[PDB]
């Protein structure tokens, strides 16, 4: 068996798996409305680039592995086309990372800023930028436009990737600026996502989950100006009047904007007032005195939502809370009008009473980042599959007199880069239930017919 035949077979097998697997990804998104979110718009765009890897880029790499004679501009397209697909993948991976950070940073206002129309515009722009970046050698930055391989006739060059694509482009422009910098930005974004889910939980973070945190002055449900965690500023219909109240409480001219620490200090003063009002109430003080620090925060949470008078009306639940009958107090509180009006917030507060822990709010944070862990794996696989080729290009560039990397390492690094166009659909099937369920439906019904 020829050594070339095993390289062709492996490349064609990767191409088939890249097409079939990523067609299934787009097919699943088109079929399942539950998969038609903005995050999957970039997943589809990422899959579209991987489909093109198996249809064009991999056949292109096979032809230029021979170094045949061809025109300069025509040879550059065959060599630089995969640079367009890889750049579009980087933009799609960077967009997914930023999208998931917005999802955990402003989880209540995520859908107002992140829209489908905006995503399609970003995708269309990034594809234009990917062609400009990937096909930069065709616009002049090439090595076949200067008079001087030999044995091909003039106007024709030996179509080898390292012969026609400049190495300083492959290292400075492509690797350092267009690959390494986005990969490091994606690393910091995902790190920042994971740290926010691992944040310390307290009364400030609990109410931030229940009532939101806003550092800019906004209008509440009643049209009144608010800041921080539900801190009413004024009933007046003047933002200037609200800013004057905000500046009087912060101690600095804010122009309606405050820092997170100032919102925490403002919220801390609101807790002190709610605690002062609880202690002066003869119904609430005995219960509050008996509760632990966490369960006291759940009682303050109720006061912030309904008021001391409204909480004092829970005569039966308050006595069972004071008697440390957590499970009995949970059943009683669940049968209240407060539970029916806002069950999600009530269930989190009731769970706090049962356990005395922050588990209900920790689980809220963990649910917001579970998708980010799977999508972060895809970025690491992209880095793992492409960095060997980049590092070698650096060795050839910065050590010209060095011995070039051996042929088997070239074949391995190039094939490993093509393999990355296969791994993503497997990740979706293994870690995303909605993708896995649609994959099974398409396969069992549309493909296998039964
Ligand atoms: C494109 C790219 C990106 C992107 N986008 C990012 C980093 C690096 C690269 C990249 C790619 C190729 C390449 C060469 N070939 C044809 C080929 C196939 C098999 C064997 C051979 C031999 C005989 C060894 O020359 N040649 N296919 N890709 N070569 C180099 N230095 N870098
Ligand atoms: C540590 C990482 C994140 C940043 C450093 C960039 C790395 C990837 C680049 C920058 C400089 C590069 C070169 C530094 C110097 C050497 C020596 C030279 O005989 C060949 C390559 C080689 C080995 C390069 C290796 C890769 C290289 C180290
Ligand atoms: C994250 C995914 C991990 C899975 C990916 C693992 C690494 C990629 C597989 C390489 C095997 C094929 C590499 C060898 C290339 C073909 C064999 C060859 O080199 O033949 C050329 C011959 O020497 C001259 O014609
Ligand atoms: C024609 C387009 C559709 C062709 C599809 C057949 C070709 C499969 C190719 C690549 C695998 C794709 C990535 C792996 C997806 C597997 C999903 C799956 O089967 O998961 C269900 C299983 O029951 C879990 O337990
Ligand atoms: C997944 C299934 C992939 C099946 C095979 C891919 C095509 C193999 C054809 C080998 C031809 C190469 C040659 O003979 O030179
Ligand atoms: C040859 C290049 C083929 C490129 C990709 C073809 C499929 C593009 C993905 C769009 C699918 C539409 C959708 O899933 O909503
Ligand atoms: C190899 C290139 C051709 C294969 C890639 C493109 C085909 C797969 C694309 C996505 C499948 C689901 C989207 C198709 C939309 C069909 C439109 C319609 O039927 O109304
Ligand atoms: C080869 C060139 C392929 C270019 C990109 C195909 C279109 C991008 C995939 C569709 C994204 C829009 C969407 O899914 O909503
Ligand atoms: C999955 C669809 C794409 C596959 C079909 C495209 C055909 C394959 C492309 C060219 C393979 C053979 C041409 C180059 C021969 C290389 C000669 C050599 O190995 O030295
Ligand atoms: C699924 C179908 C995929 C088709 C892949 C086609 C592969 C084409 C590979 C290179 C063929 C030569 C193209 C460049 C020649 C132009 C330069 C010249 O004429 O000198
Ligand atoms: C798909 C086709 C995309 C564009 C191909 C452009 C080729 C660049 C110039 C070709 C040189 C030549 O004719 O030999
Ligand atoms: C799925 C179908 C994809 C459509 C494109 C098919 C493959 C195109 C391959 C590259 C052609 C462009 C490279 C050289 C162009 C000049 C060649 C010439 O003019 O004869
Ligand atoms: C232009 C290339 C650089 C952009 C790469 C990706 C950056 C955007 C990432 C996706 C964010 C998700 C959609 C949010 C829409 C942005 C809101 C707006 O238009 O200001
Ligand atoms: C040559 C054609 C190459 C691929 C065209 C892909 C662009 C059109 C599909 C867009 C998918 C969509 O958003 O509906
Ligand atoms: C000679 C080389 C010719 C290069 C042609 C490429 C120029 C067109 C730019 C990108 C085409 C891919 C379309 C992707 C945008 C559709 C995504 C969307 O808006 O939903
Ligand atoms: C068209 C959208 C915006 C495009 C800007 C980014 C794409 C890259 C554009 C061209 C880069 C050219 C870099 C010039 C390097 C020196 C030229 C040379 O030495 O030959
Ligand atoms: C995706 C983000 C892309 C950012 C592109 C802008 C950054 C470009 C930075 C410089 C790269 C090239 C540095 C030296 C130019 C080559 C010198 C020459 O040969 O003329
Ligand atoms: C981050 C982007 C880094 C871009 C390049 C840094 C080094 C630039 C040196 C240019 C050398 C000029 C040349 O290539 O001839
Ligand atoms: C250095 C360039 C960038 C390298 C890739 C950057 C993306 C890293 C993203 C997250 C890594 C994978 C996260 C999966 C969690 C598994 C637990 C673990 O092993 O750490
Ligand atoms: C060198 C570029 C490193 C980029 C990392 C940016 C910080 C990460 C972040 O906070 O988003
Ligand atoms: C891990 C990826 C390391 C890639 C190997 C670089 C070898 C350097 C060389 O052989 O010139
Ligand atoms: C994360 C696991 C993804 C598995 C994808 C398949 C790996 C092997 C890739 C192609 C094999 C070609 C021989
Ligand atoms: Na890709």
């Amino acid at each position: 068996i020829m050594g070339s035949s095993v390289y062709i077979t492996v490349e064609l097998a990767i191409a088939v798996l890249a097409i079939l697997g990523n067609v299934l990804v787009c097919w699943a998104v088109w079929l399942n409305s539950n998969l038609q979110n903005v995050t999957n718009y970039f997943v589809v765009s990422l899959a579209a680039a991987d489909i093109a890897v198996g249809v064009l880029a991999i056949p292109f790499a096979i032809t230029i592995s021979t170094g045949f004679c061809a025109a300069c501009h025509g040879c550059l397209f065959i060599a630089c086309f995969v640079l367009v697909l890889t750049q579009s993948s980087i933009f799609s991976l960077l967009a997914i990372a930023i999208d998931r950070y917005i999802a955990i940073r402003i989880p209540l206002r995520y859908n107002g800023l992140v829209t489908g129309t905006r995503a399609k515009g970003i995708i269309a722009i990034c594809w234009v930028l990917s062609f400009a970046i990937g096909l930069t050698p065709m616009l002049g930055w090439n090595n076949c436009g200067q008079p001087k391989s030999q044995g091909c006739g003039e106007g024709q060059v030996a179509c080898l990737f390292e012969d026609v694509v400049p190495m300083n482009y492959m290292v400075y422009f492509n690797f350092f600026a267009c690959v390494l910098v986005p990969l490091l930005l994606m690393l910091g974004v995902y790190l920042r996502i994971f740290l926010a889910a691992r944040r310390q939980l307290n009364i400030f973070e609990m109410l931030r989950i229940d009532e939101g945190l806003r550092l800019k002055i906004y209008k509440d449900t009643e049209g009144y100006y608010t800041i921080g965690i539900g801190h009413l500023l004024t009933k007046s219909p003047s933002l200037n009047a609200a800013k004057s109240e905000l500046d009087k409480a912060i101690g600095r001219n804010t122009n309606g904007v405050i820092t997170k620490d100032e919102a925490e200090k403002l919220f801390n003063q609101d807790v002190d007032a709610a605690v002062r009002g609880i202690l002066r109430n003869a119904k609430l003080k005995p219960v509050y005195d008996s509760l632990d620090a966490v369960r006291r925060a759940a009682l303050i949470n109720m006061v912030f939502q309904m008021g001391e008078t409204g909480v004092a009306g829970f005569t039966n639940s308050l006595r069972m809370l004071q008697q440390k009958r957590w499970d009995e107090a949970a059943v009683n509180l669940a049968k209240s009008r407060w539970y029916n009006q806002t069950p999600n917030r009530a269930k989190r507060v009731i769970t706090t009473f049962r356990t005395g822990t922050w588990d209900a709010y920790r689980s809220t944070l963990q649910k917001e980042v579970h998708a980010a862990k799977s999508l972060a794996i895809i970025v690491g696989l992209f880095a793992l599959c492409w960095l060997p080729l980049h590092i070698i290009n650096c060795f050839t560039f910065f050590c010209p007199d060095c011995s070039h990397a051996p042929l088997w390492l070239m074949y391995l690094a190039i094939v490993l880069s093509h393999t990355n166009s296969v791994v993503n659909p497997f990740i979706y099937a293994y870690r995303i239930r909605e993708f896995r369920q649609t994959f099974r439906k398409i396969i069992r019904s549309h493909v296998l017919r039964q």
Side-chain angles (χ1 to χ4, degrees), residues 2 4-17 20:
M2 263 213 92
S4 270
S5 299
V6 317
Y7 162 75
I8 311 278
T9 304
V10 165
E11 290 273 74
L12 293 189
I14 290 165
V16 165
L17 259 280
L20 294 196

Side-chain angles (χ1 to χ4, degrees), residues 223-225 234-239 241-242:
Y224 302 132
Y225 289 109
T234 181
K235 248 144 92 172
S236 189
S238 163
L239 166 68

Side-chain angles (χ1 to χ4, degrees), residues 222-233:
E222 329 172 277
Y224 302 132
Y225 289 109
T226 323
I227 194 70
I229 311 203
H231 185 82
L232 197 286
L233 285 169

Side-chain angles (χ1 to χ4, degrees), residues 352-401:
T352 312
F353 278 135
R354 252 179 111 194
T355 71
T357 68
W358 305 107
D359 284 5
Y361 301 81
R362 178 66 72 200
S363 147
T364 291
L365 304 187
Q366 303 192 140
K367 204 55 207 103
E368 282 162 40
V369 304
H370 179 61
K373 329 192 153 201
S374 313
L375 301 164
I377 284 155
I378 286 131
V379 183
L381 291 184
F382 186 92
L384 203 90
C385 283
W386 277 108
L387 274 180
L389 245 176
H390 286 289
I391 281 146
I392 292 165
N393 281 347
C394 291
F395 271 80
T396 313
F397 187 61
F398 292 124
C399 203
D401 59 328

